[PDB]
């Protein structure tokens, strides 16, 4: 019967890894589609178009990408195109943002000619609510691809991944840089490191942090500090910026849990 539990455990752990991999593929595909959409905006924005055409392109970009909460454009040679667009409930609000290029991070993207990424942060939206997310920056180029003429900044809403992570389920965690919880069913965990939340189980947490750094995947067990019951745990990393080459392209991670007692209670 000890061998019964062992074969139950193996079966459960494998199915968790299968379920988690499909979930990672779902989240990656959301990101990849947004990146593809950004790539098309990046090409179209520097062409000779009306200012209103550019604005409406950025609005439609937001409308077509449910996980984007805002977008900005900056042009070196044009003060009239230093604009930020943010979701404003049913509409999209336009705002002037003249210092948009005068920060060290925007300059980084434009000097490097490469995709750049911020760390997760809370952005104040037009209605005064805060949205947790990350900025992705791409340099805007001239048609001859040798001169950078500006920058596109895309605010990806981490909170909008509730659709994949917390909608009608509470067994998933989205984890980011150095073990920060980006999204989980328990809202109070957001922006806190797993090293703090799960300090009661340092062996399991250090193992998760090592997998996060090394870009791997694994299963393990741990005593959950909220339920006080042992859980099965599967984790899997993926490159947050995808195949795109950049020093800012680090691993995100999705974690899936199952309470051990519930597996064994079924037998």
Ligand X SMILES: c1ccc2[nH]ccc2c1
When asked if residue 201 is in the footprint of ligand X (CB under 6 A), the reply is yes
Closest CA to 184 of 266, 106, 84, 253: 253
Q: How far is the CB of 224 from ligand X (least distance, A)?
A: 7
When asked if residue 212 is in the footprint of ligand X (CB under 6 A), the reply is no
- Output the CA torsion 246→193→23→13 (10° steps): 120
Among 137, 194, 211, 250, binds ligand X (CB under 6 A): 194
| Residue whose CB is less far from ligand X, 100 or 194 | 194
When asked if residue 211 is in the footprint of ligand X (CB under 6 A), the reply is no
Among 30, 38, 140, 208, binds ligand X (CB under 6 A): 208
- SS3 state of residue 2: helix
Q: How far is the CB of 257 from ligand X (least distance, A)?
A: 6
Q: Which stretch binds ligand X (CB under 6 A): 21-29, 44-52, 138-146, 198-206?
A: 198-206
H helix count then E strand count, the chain = 7, 12
CA distance 240 to 252: 6
Q: How far is the CB of 133 from ligand X (least distance, A)?
A: 21
Strands 130-141 and 172-175: unpaired
When asked if residue 232 is in the footprint of ligand X (CB under 6 A), the reply is no
| Residue whose CB is less far from ligand X, 75 or 173 | 173
CA distance 75 to 152: 9
Q: Return the DSSP state at 115.
A: -
Among 35, 74, 161, 198, binds ligand X (CB under 6 A): 198
Burial class of residue 167, CB neighbours in 10 A (0-12, 13-18, 19+): exposed
Burial class of residue 52, CB neighbours in 10 A (0-12, 13-18, 19+): exposed
Q: How far is the CB of 199 from ligand X (least distance, A)?
A: 9
Among 61, 173, 232, 252, binds ligand X (CB under 6 A): 173
| Residue whose CB is less far from ligand X, 102 or 227 | 227
Q: Which two tokens stand for residue 80?
A: 């009239």
Q: How far is the CB of 189 from ligand X (least distance, A)?
A: 9
When asked if residue 222 is in the footprint of ligand X (CB under 6 A), the reply is yes
| Residue whose CB is less far from ligand X, 30 or 255 | 255
Helix or strand (DSSP H, E) at 74 = strand 68-75
Q: How far is the CB of 12 from ligand X (least distance, A)?
A: 16
Strands 172-175 and 181-184: antiparallel
Q: Which stretch binds ligand X (CB under 6 A): 63-71, 105-113, 133-141, 196-204?
A: 196-204
Residues that bind ligand X (CB under 6 A): 173, 194, 198, 201, 204-205, 208, 222, 233, 255
């Amino acid at each position: 019967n000890s061998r019964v539990k062992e074969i139950l455990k193996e079966n459960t752990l494998r199915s968790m890894q299968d379920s988690l991999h499909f979930k990672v593929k779902e989240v990656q595909g959301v990101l990849e589609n947004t990146y593809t959409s950004m790539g098309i905006v990046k090409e179209m924005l520097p062409k000779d178009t009306k200012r209103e055409i550019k604005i409406h392109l950025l609005k439609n970009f937001i409308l077509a990408n449910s996980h984007v909460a805002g977008v900005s454009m900056f042009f070196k040679n044009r003060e009239d195109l230093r604009l930020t667009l943010l979701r404003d409930n049913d509409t999209i609000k336009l705002m002037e943002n003249p210092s948009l290029g005068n920060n060290p991070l925007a300059q980084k993207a434009m000097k490097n000619k490469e995709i750049s990424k911020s760390l997760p942060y809370y952005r104040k939206m037009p209605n005064g609510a805060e949205v947790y997310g990350v900025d992705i920056l791409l340099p805007l180029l001239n048609e001859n691809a040798q001169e950078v003429v500006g920058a596109l900044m895309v605010f990806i809403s981490i909170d909008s991944f509730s659709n994949e992570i917390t909608k009608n389920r509470s067994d998933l965690f989205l984890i980011g840089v150095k073990g920060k919880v980006l999204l989980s069913a328990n809202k109070s965990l957001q922006d806190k490191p797993i090293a703090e939340i799960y300090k009661s189980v340092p062996k399991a947490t250090n193992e998760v942090l090592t997998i996060l750094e090394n870009g791997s995947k694994a299963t393990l067990e741990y005593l959950d500090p909220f339920s006080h019951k042992e859980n099965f745990l599967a984790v899997e990393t993926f490159k947050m910026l995808g195949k795109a080459e950049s020093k800012d392209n680090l691993n995100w991670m999705i974690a899936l849990i199952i309470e051990k007692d519930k597996v064994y209670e079924q037998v």
